[PDB]
C-alpha cells in the first residue's frame, strides 16, 4: 500500500488550487503604488525588497522600477544592502 | 535487536516539530517487518530463500515499515491528525534462522525442500551472497 500510483500528489493539487484561485499579481497604477509605498514608510524606516513586495502586492519587476525611480538602496555592513524608501 | 532495540530506538527519537505559522508534528510509533523479500525487474515481490540470496548474490534483508502520525496546526484553532500506516523506511539484514528468517520453525524436510541444510546453524548474514558472521 506504499507509494500507491497517483496522478498528482494531494499537496501539489491543493497548492495549485490555491495559486490558481489567488491568481497572479496585477500592475497597479503608479500613483496608487506610490501612495501605498509612501504610506507604509511611516511604520518603519527601511524595508526589504521581498517583504515590500508582499506589502505592496505588485510584480517584482514593476515594483523595482517604481522603487528605482525614487527609492535607493544603502549598503549595510551588518546584514546586507537593503532598499531605502527615502529618495534622498 | 529486532524485537526490542529497533522499536525502542524509534520510540526514543523525539517527535519532529516543523514551523513555517502552521506547525507540523511527525511521530514514529510502531515498527513492522516482513519476511525477507526480493523484487524482480517487473517489481513483483517474492519471498527470498537464503540459497537464492547466496546464488544470485542478493542481500538477505527484510523490509522495514514504520507507522507515522502526522498532525497539522494552522493557527486557526483546528487540528487535523492523519497517520501513514506502515511507511517503508529501509531493509534490515536478517540473521539466518532467527525468528524473522524464512527458515524459522521449519521442519528438516521443509529446510531440504528449500535446499537448506538442516544441520546449518544459521547465526550469520548473507550480504551480497556472502555469508557474513559478526565476531563477538
Amino acid at each position: 500500500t506504499n507509494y500507491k500510483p497517483v496522478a498528482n500528489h494531494q499537496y501539489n493539487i491543493e497548492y495549485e488550487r490555491k495559486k490558481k484561485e489567488d491568481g497572479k499579481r496585477a500592475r497597479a497604477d503608479k500613483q496608487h503604488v506610490l501612495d501605498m509605498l509612501f504610506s507604509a514608510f511611516e511604520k518603519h524606516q527601511y524595508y526589504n525588497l521581498k517583504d515590500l513586495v508582499d506589502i505592496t502586492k505588485q510584480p517584482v519587476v514593476y515594483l523595482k522600477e517604481i522603487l528605482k525611480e525614487i527609492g535607493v538602496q544603502n549598503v549595510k555592513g551588518i546584514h546586507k544592502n537593503t532598499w531605502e524608501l527615502k529618495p534622498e | 535487536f529486532i524485537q526490542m532495540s529497533v522499536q525502542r530506538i524509534v520510540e526514543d527519537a523525539p517527535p519532529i516539530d516543523l514551523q513555517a505559522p502552521p506547525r507540523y508534528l511527525l511521530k514514529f510509533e510502531q515498527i513492522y517487518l516482513s519476511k525477507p523479500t526480493h523484487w524482480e525487474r517487473d517489481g513483483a515481490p517474492s519471498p527470498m530463500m537464503p540459497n537464492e540470496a547466496r546464488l544470485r548474490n542478493l542481500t538477505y534483508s527484510a523490509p522495514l515499515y514504520v507507522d507515522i502520525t502526522k498532525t497539522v496546526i494552522k493557527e486557526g484553532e483546528e487540528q487535523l491528525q492523519t497517520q501513514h500506516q506502515k511507511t517503508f523506511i529501509g531493509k534490515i539484514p536478517i540473521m539466518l534462522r532467527s525468528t524473522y528468517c524464512l527458515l524459522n520453525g521449519l521442519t528438516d524436510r521443509d529446510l531440504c525442500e528449500l535446499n537448506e541444510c538442516p544441520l546449518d546453524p544459521g547465526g550469520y548474514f548473507i550480504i551480497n551472497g556472502s555469508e557474513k558472521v559478526l565476531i563477538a
Partner: protein, 179 residues
C-alpha cells in the same frame, strides 16, 4: 480520397497599430471581459461569426473561433472597428492566420498500434497520456491526432492547402491500417 477536412477553428493575429487601455475597453466594450490577475489580455466575444479575440494593450489582437479564413478576417475587422469606436486609432495591419484546425473521419476504425510501429519516426502513441495517436507530418508541418474511432484532427496549418495536403498524405497510410 473523397473526404475533405472541415476547418473547425481558425487562429489569426492582427496589429491595430496603437497602444490600448485595457481597463477603458472593458468598462465600455459590450462583451469584453478583463482580468489582469488571470490574463493580461482583454477577451471579447461576438455571435454572428462566433469567434473570440484577445486584445492586448500593445495594440496587437489575436482572433480565434472562426471556421473560415473569410470569417476570421471579418470577425477581426469587427473587433478592430469596435475598439476604434471606443476612441482608439485602431487599424487593420498585417492581418495573418497563425493556425488552422480541421476535423474529418475516415469512416473506418484504425489500428493505432500498427501505425505507430510503421511510423515510429513521426507517431507518438501513449494511451496513458492521450488515447489518440499524435502523428507529426514532416513535408507539411502538420500534427495529426488519429483515433481508433477513425476521427482525424489536423492542426498547425498556416493555409487551407496544408490541411488538405496533409490529409491526402495521411489517408493512404491510414487506409493501410484499416481495422
Amino acid at each position: 480520397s473523397g473526404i475533405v477536412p472541415q476547418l473547425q477553428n481558425i487562429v489569426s493575429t492582427v496589429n491595430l497599430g496603437c497602444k490600448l487601455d485595457l481597463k477603458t475597453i472593458a468598462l465600455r466594450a459590450r462583451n469584453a471581459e478583463y482580468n489582469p490577475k488571470r490574463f493580461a489580455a482583454v477577451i471579447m466575444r461576438i455571435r454572428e461569426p462566433r469567434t473570440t479575440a484577445l486584445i492586448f494593450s500593445s495594440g496587437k489582437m489575436v482572433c480565434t473561433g472562426a471556421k473560415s479564413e473569410e470569417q476570421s478576417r471579418l470577425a477581426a475587422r469587427k473587433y478592430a472597428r469596435v475598439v476604434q469606436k471606443l476612441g482608439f486609432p485602431a487599424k487593420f495591419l498585417d492581418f495573418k492566420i497563425q493556425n488552422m484546425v480541421g476535423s474529418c473521419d475516415v469512416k473506418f476504425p484504425i489500428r493505432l498500434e500498427g501505425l505507430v510501429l510503421t511510423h515510429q519516426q513521426f507517431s507518438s502513441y501513449e494511451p496513458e497520456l492521450f488515447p489518440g495517436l499524435i502523428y507529426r507530418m514532416i513535408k507539411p508541418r502538420i500534427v495529426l491526432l488519429i483515433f481508433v474511432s477513425g476521427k482525424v484532427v489536423l492542426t498547425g496549418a498556416k493555409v487551407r492547402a496544408e490541411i488538405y495536403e496533409a490529409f491526402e498524405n495521411i489517408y493512404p497510410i491510414l487506409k493501410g491500417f484499416r481495422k
